[PDB]
Coordinates of all heavy atoms in Angstrom, one line a residue:
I1008 N 13.6 26.4 -8.0 CA 13.1 27.2 -7.0 C 11.6 27.3 -7.0 O 11.0 28.2 -6.4 CB 13.7 28.6 -7.1 CG1 15.2 28.6 -6.9 CG2 13.0 29.6 -6.1 CD1 15.9 29.9 -7.3
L1009 N 10.9 26.4 -7.7 CA 9.5 26.3 -7.7 C 8.9 26.0 -6.3 O 7.7 26.2 -6.1 CB 9.0 25.4 -8.7 CG 7.5 25.0 -8.9 CD1 6.7 26.3 -8.8 CD2 7.3 24.4 -10.3
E1010 N 9.6 25.3 -5.5 CA 9.1 24.9 -4.2 C 9.8 25.6 -3.0 O 11.0 25.3 -2.8 CB 9.1 23.4 -4.0 CG 8.9 22.7 -5.4 CD 10.2 22.1 -5.9 OE1 11.2 22.7 -5.7 OE2 10.1 21.0 -6.6
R1011 N 9.1 26.4 -2.2 CA 7.8 27.1 -2.4 C 6.5 26.2 -2.4 O 5.6 26.5 -1.6 CB 7.8 27.9 -3.7 CG 6.5 28.7 -4.0 CD 6.8 30.1 -4.4 NE 7.6 30.2 -5.5 CZ 7.2 30.3 -6.8 NH1 5.9 30.2 -7.1 NH2 8.1 30.4 -7.8
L1012 N 6.4 25.2 -3.2 CA 5.2 24.4 -3.2 C 5.1 23.8 -1.9 O 4.0 23.7 -1.3 CB 5.2 23.3 -4.2 CG 5.2 23.7 -5.7 CD1 4.7 22.5 -6.5 CD2 4.2 24.8 -5.8
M1013 N 6.2 23.3 -1.4 CA 6.2 22.6 -0.1 C 7.1 23.3 0.8 O 8.2 23.7 0.4 CB 6.8 21.2 -0.3 CG 7.9 21.1 -1.3 SD 8.6 19.3 -1.3 CE 8.2 18.9 0.5
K1014 N 6.7 23.6 2.0 CA 7.5 24.5 2.9 C 7.6 23.9 4.3 O 6.8 23.0 4.7 CB 7.0 25.9 2.9 CG 7.7 26.8 2.0 CD 7.3 28.3 2.1 CE 5.9 28.5 1.5 NZ 4.9 27.5 2.1
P1015 N 8.6 24.4 5.1 CA 9.0 23.5 6.2 C 7.9 23.3 7.2 O 7.2 24.2 7.4 CB 10.2 24.3 6.8 CG 9.8 25.7 6.7 CD 9.5 25.7 5.2
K1016 N 7.9 22.1 7.7 CA 6.9 21.8 8.8 C 7.3 22.6 10.0 O 8.4 22.7 10.4 CB 7.0 20.3 9.1 CG 5.8 19.8 9.9 CD 4.6 19.7 9.0 CE 3.8 18.4 9.2 NZ 2.4 18.5 8.8
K1017 N 6.4 23.5 10.5 CA 5.0 23.4 11.1 C 4.8 22.6 12.4 O 3.8 21.9 12.6 CB 4.0 23.0 10.1 CG 2.5 23.1 10.5 CD 2.3 24.0 11.7 CE 1.2 23.6 12.6 NZ 0.8 24.6 13.6
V1018 N 5.8 22.6 13.3 CA 5.8 21.6 14.4 C 4.7 21.6 15.5 O 4.2 20.6 15.9 CB 7.1 21.6 15.2
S1019 N 4.3 22.8 16.0 CA 3.4 22.8 17.2 C 2.7 24.1 17.3 O 2.8 25.0 16.5 CB 4.1 22.5 18.4 OG 3.3 22.7 19.5
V1020 N 1.9 24.2 18.4 CA 0.9 25.3 18.5 C 1.5 26.7 18.4 O 0.9 27.6 17.9 CB 0.1 25.3 19.9 CG1 -1.2 24.6 19.6 CG2 0.9 24.6 20.9
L1021 N 2.7 26.9 19.0 CA 3.4 28.1 18.9 C 4.1 28.3 17.5 O 4.8 29.3 17.3 CB 4.5 28.2 20.0 CG 4.0 27.6 21.3 CD1 4.3 26.1 21.3 CD2 4.6 28.2 22.5
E1022 N 4.0 27.4 16.6 CA 4.7 27.4 15.3 C 6.2 27.2 15.7 O 7.1 28.0 15.2 CB 4.5 28.6 14.5 CG 5.1 28.5 13.1 CD 4.4 29.4 12.1 OE1 4.2 30.6 12.4 OE2 4.1 29.0 10.9
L1023 N 6.6 26.2 16.5 CA 7.9 25.9 16.7 C 8.4 25.2 15.4 O 7.7 24.5 14.8 CB 8.1 24.9 17.9 CG 7.5 25.5 19.2 CD1 6.9 24.4 20.0 CD2 8.6 26.2 20.0
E1024 N 9.7 25.5 15.1 CA 10.2 25.0 13.8 C 10.2 23.6 13.5 O 9.9 23.2 12.4 CB 11.6 25.5 13.6
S1025 N 10.5 22.8 14.5 CA 10.6 21.3 14.5 C 11.9 21.0 13.9 O 12.4 21.7 13.1 CB 9.5 20.7 13.6 OG 9.8 21.2 12.2
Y1026 N 12.5 19.9 14.3 CA 13.7 19.4 13.8 C 13.3 18.8 12.4 O 12.2 18.5 12.2 CB 14.4 18.4 14.6 CG 13.8 17.0 14.6 CD1 13.9 16.2 13.5 CD2 13.2 16.5 15.7 CE1 13.3 15.0 13.5 CE2 12.6 15.3 15.7 CZ 12.7 14.5 14.6 OH 12.2 13.3 14.7
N1027 N 14.3 18.7 11.6 CA 14.2 17.8 10.5 C 13.3 18.3 9.4 O 13.2 17.7 8.4 CB 13.7 16.4 10.9 CG 13.9 15.3 9.9 OD1 14.8 15.3 9.1 ND2 13.0 14.4 9.9

Side-chain angles (χ1 to χ4, degrees), residues 1008-1017 1019-1023 1025-1027:
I1008 294 169
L1009 175 42
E1010 326 104 329
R1011 182 135 56 91
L1012 293 199
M1013 38 175 330
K1014 262 184 289 56
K1016 197 71 138 160
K1017 193 18 213 193
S1019 173
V1020 263
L1021 327 85
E1022 189 158 47
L1023 302 144
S1025 61
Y1026 75 69
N1027 192 31

